[model samples]
Target chain A: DPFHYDYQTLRIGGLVFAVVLFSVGILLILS
Target chain B: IWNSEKKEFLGRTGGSWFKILLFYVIFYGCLAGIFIGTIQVMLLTISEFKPTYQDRVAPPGLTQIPQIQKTEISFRPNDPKSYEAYVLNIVRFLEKYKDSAQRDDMIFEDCGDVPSEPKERGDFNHERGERKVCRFKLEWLGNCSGLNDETYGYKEGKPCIIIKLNRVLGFKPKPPKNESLETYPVMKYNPNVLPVQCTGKRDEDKDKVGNVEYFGLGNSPGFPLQYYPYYGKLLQPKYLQPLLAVQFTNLTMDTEIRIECKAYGENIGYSEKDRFQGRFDVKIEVKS
Candidate 1:
């Protein structure tokens, strides 16, 4: 069960990853 | 989306939730540290006093007060409403040159008759460690000083316009070249001063513009070289740019005429396309 992630956990993790990726992308463009 | 039976929140166990949050915290903390460090390094490379690059192509420009859009100064001298704002502009422009204000922050020196050349960080006063500026008294402006006539001749249909040369860091006006002294004697012009001349823009407008008188440092018809080569603002905090007042008298009332004023120097360039580059043209009309 520790290895298994439910649908809500998967969606939340994907959103967090997307946010970090976009933030770094913006910083890269500005620099 | 909480699973109460297994003590889980948002379908993630406590251990899993803590691990993900800790990872994000560490990642963002590293990113912020890098950004701040980069900014500090960049700031160390820049100087606070002067710009890293300057435009060397153009010499200092000439500016005038009672500044208006389209460079047109058309006003009915008899009507207060017509010329009120123009008079106010001149009064405000000269406020800093008042005796009271000059004494507060400025430490002015006589500078003597000889031109004061810029030293390589050598002429600063020992007390304040700042450069000493030359004194430019308000009385030198003559009739246009705003002391005798508050309206600066605007009430009498003769308008006095104040012209100033824009500040260019470490700029020194050079004397005109010696190649053209055949017709005129070499000593006819004083090489130490930057001459300011005002004339009608067109040949037909010359007579209509009437008599113009220039007031500046002593008998010189322009800015003297003794106050020049201004250091940056930080170094010479009390430095005041020299001013020349041009008074137009007996102007043809109700007729618009273009007046051109130019600051003469060997380094000054004239461009027809650029109006303020060492010279400017203004359309002035005094209505009866």
Candidate 2:
């Protein structure tokens, strides 16, 4: 499990953060 | 200081923090891009001037008819000798609002059975060609209607003033968000929107003026609610601006009584300086 810190893990994390930030942008525009 | 033992500068090898710098740069770049993208997309969804939340802002303001050119109703009641012109000025100005006078300017009709309930009465309409007209019955101004008081109290220290708000196309008089008067005062909407409310120049002045009344005569509201969201002049051709008749029952004679007729709405401003606001201030001197 120690080797679970692979590139895929970082990619998923990045994608999640990106989605969150993207949602913020859309809301600011809509609001 | 260089970590000579580890052959690295500041305890780090040649380019260790490079990944961290790149990670932060990419993260921040994505954040900025998200911010910009959202605004751009939202802009595309929006009109240049008009907004989806139009009702939240831009409620039309109230205006007094026969704006009397120079100043307020400065009628000196005691000295009718010189105030004849002022009294007549008001009379002549009001001559047009007469049911007989409105014959040409506006089409009139009785709504037959006027509903007593506020909910049913509001926004009621009957077909008039392509437009639906809400009959604003202002035929009676109580005592000030020039019927009981022929002189309109101008000569006898009694005066009636009619007020109406300027119509903005498609604008609705929004009601208070909640029943809490403590929070949003201006948003208080009179379900039976007659001449909103009138008060003396000051709080004490209102208490002193005591006997003033809205001369509805058990008829239309002071400013009838029926004549709202006035569509447009093109659509509602004969749309007359709703009137509110304010009669100072027995004004404080020989003293300057400042009066104002106010309508409650977020956009309506009633400052002594700004006449264009959805309210008006006039000073009258009723002499003995």
Candidate 3:
């Protein structure tokens, strides 16, 4: 029922988190 | 992966999909805000005009004329082909000092006539009309002036070597306390009286190279005081460093001589590690 919806939501959040973390890491290295 | 009969993904309805899309928009908006905030912080630290590091903490070094070449000077007079190439290098290099070459937005005027000392700590040049452009002339080098001898002593083994001071913004060639001279002023303004001392590579070669005749006026071999404490090209716009010419009156034929020219002062330094620090070397081979 709600199990599949929950799984996709978690996947989307994880992907966005990874993208943002990598961007900040690059900024840190440059400065 | 949606089937025709059962179009739902693990039984998720169309309404549920719209809610997921809404969450994504808000989530990305927050992420973008964080990115922009970091960028603003970096922009705050930077200034438009001034550099973060001043002076060349490493220091601005010196170099000689014909320095555009990546390799060392080599001459073989026994072969006509080799001799032609070597003479070409000298002729082509001096061509830049010609009146026509120096006129094209290179320098403003001859700084040789500038006052010998500075009255104040600093001065400014803001007037546009006062900044009139003029050509820098290479004075006659006696027998080696290229006019007297078309080959400029290349064929006769009397080579006229031109030494030009390298441009360094705001660098003052000061004489230190220990070796300071009264005639030499250690101030912000350059007193162009600094004589460029020329010698052989090693102590043994000094006698072999012998005395050199300067091409500039009087006994002063280096540039004038007005050439010092240079402002940037943006500030001065048409700044050009002074040029000095020396004629080796005599040289032993068929011998390789290591010639070095040094601008002596406290601020000017000679080093094996830093090759360009107020001194430069050229290996000359005089062919018979």
TM-scores of chain A across the candidates, in order, are: 0.69, 0.72, 0.66
DockQ of 1: 0.01
Question: Candidate 2 local accuracy as lDDT?
Answer: 0.55
True contacts kept of 3: 0.00
TM-score-sorted candidate list, best first: 1, 3, 2
lDDT of 2 by residue, A1-31 (tens): 1111356888999999999999999999999
Alpha carbon lDDT at B217, candidate 2? 27
Higher-TM-score candidate among 1 and 2? 1
Q: Please identify which of the two predictions, 1 or 3, would achieve the higher TM-score against the true structure.
A: 1
TM-score to true structure, per model:
0.71, 0.54, 0.59
Candidate 1 residue spans exceeding 4 A from truth: A1-31, B1-39, B104-106, B113-128, B144-151, B179-188
Tens-digit lDDT track of model 2 for B119-221: 2222223333334454544455556334643535545545566666766655545433445442222423445443356667788777677455554524533
Cα interface RMSD of each candidate? 29.8, 24.9, 27.9
DockQ-based CAPRI category assigned to the predicted complex of candidate 2: incorrect
Q: DockQ score of candidate 2?
A: 0.02
Model 1 collision count: 0
Clashing pairs in 1: none
Ten-residue region with minimum lDDT total, candidate 1 chain B: B179-188
Docking class of 1: incorrect
